[PDB]
Amino acid sequence: GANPYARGPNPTAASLEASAGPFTVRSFTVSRPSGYGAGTVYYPTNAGGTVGAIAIVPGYTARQSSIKWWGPRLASHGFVVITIDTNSTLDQPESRSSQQMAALGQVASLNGDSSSPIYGKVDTARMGVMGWAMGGGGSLISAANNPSLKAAAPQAPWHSSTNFSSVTVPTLIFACENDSIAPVASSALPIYDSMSQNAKQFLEICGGSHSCANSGNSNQALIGKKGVAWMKRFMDNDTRYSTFACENPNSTAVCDFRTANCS
């Protein structure tokens, strides 16, 4: 019958482009981080069923502020979102992946903690990974190592190897045209081209610096619609989002669009 994971009203371009989704969001600071530096958990208060969880990691030198906008944007659509600070702001992609996974593990633990605001709010079997730059590379390593993850959506990713041919997890790569830190042509695009087994998409923002998908970006309507639609489609199996997830958005803000194996 019905998809047991579907949450929220039927989507529209306007409802996905809006600053906020349909659910009320609250947040808390993790009192004792397990395996990472610090975290903030964003959650819907009124989703109507258990929701999946997404862990988001910053880039080199960076903190939760760089990635914070995703917490309310995704949680308002029916997700538990943990944004993390790493043990060191100078940790590399492998370590960022371990930390990201440790954060997912703690979100799973908090689902079982009767003192937590997310007690019984999480479907621990449905998880996703995001992150910026080295954190984007960490997210891809997470996906490679943990193929039960349901979706990945890194931004301006970098890793010392571009070979992510082992990834079977649906992966959306946000890229920034004018990235001077992790140039598209040597980083995000080779990573995208490596992936052969999965649903995948590539979305490059015209004129974007390395921070083009960070908090305070000027394309939150398009980037947020894409990120939410990809997570809805693949973490929730929610085919109401198939077109939003798979379409070329036909946008003057998009300077490179690719997709494969999307339905």
Ligand X SMILES: O=C(O)c1ccc(C(=O)OCCO)cc1
User: DSSP 3-state assignment of 155?
Assistant: strand
Please say which residue, 70 or 158, places its beta carbon nearer to ligand X: 158
SS3 string of 199-252? Answer: CEEEEEECCCCCCCCCCCCCCHHHHHHHHHHHHHHHHCCCHHHHHHHHCCCCCC
CA dihedral 146, 237, 123, 192 (to 10 degrees): 30
Please say which residue, 89 or 243, places its beta carbon nearer to ligand X: 89
What string marks each residue from 78 to 117 as x (binds ligand X by CB under 6 A) or -?
----------------------------------------
Smallest gap from Cβ 150 to ligand X, in A, equals 25
Cα separation of 58 and 88, whole Å? 11
Smallest gap from Cβ 207 to ligand X, in A, equals 19
Scanning the structure block, which residue is given the tokens 């974007």? 208
- In the range 31-60, which residues lie near ligand X by CB under 6 A? 59-60
Smallest gap from Cβ 22 to ligand X, in A, equals 33
Smallest gap from Cβ 58 to ligand X, in A, equals 8
Please say which residue, 23 or 158, places its beta carbon nearer to ligand X: 158
Angle at which helices 134-145 and 93-111 pack, to 10 degrees?
60
Please say which residue, 118 or 188, places its beta carbon nearer to ligand X: 188
The residues pairing with 167 across neighbouring beta strands, listed in sequence order, are none
User: DSSP 3-state assignment of 263?
Assistant: coil
- Say if CB 110 and CB 77 are below 8 A apart: no
Smallest gap from Cβ 140 to ligand X, in A, equals 13
Scanning the structure block, which residue is given the tokens 């997912």? 104
Smallest gap from Cβ 45 to ligand X, in A, equals 33
Please say which residue, 198 or 214, places its beta carbon nearer to ligand X: 214
Q: How many residues bind ligand X (CB under 6 A)?
A: 8
Per CB under 6 A, the segment of 31-39, 162-170, 175-183, 212-220 that binds ligand X is 175-183
- In the range 178-197, which residues lie near ligand X by CB under 6 A? 181-183
Alpha helices in the chain (DSSP H): 13-17, 64-67, 70-75, 93-111, 134-145, 188-194, 220-235, 242-246
Q: Which of 110, 122, 133, 231 binds ligand X (CB under 6 A)?
A: 133
- Take residue 37 and report the two structure tokens written for it: 């530096």
Please say which residue, 21 or 136, places its beta carbon nearer to ligand X: 136
Residues that bind ligand X (CB under 6 A): 59-60, 133-134, 158, 181-183
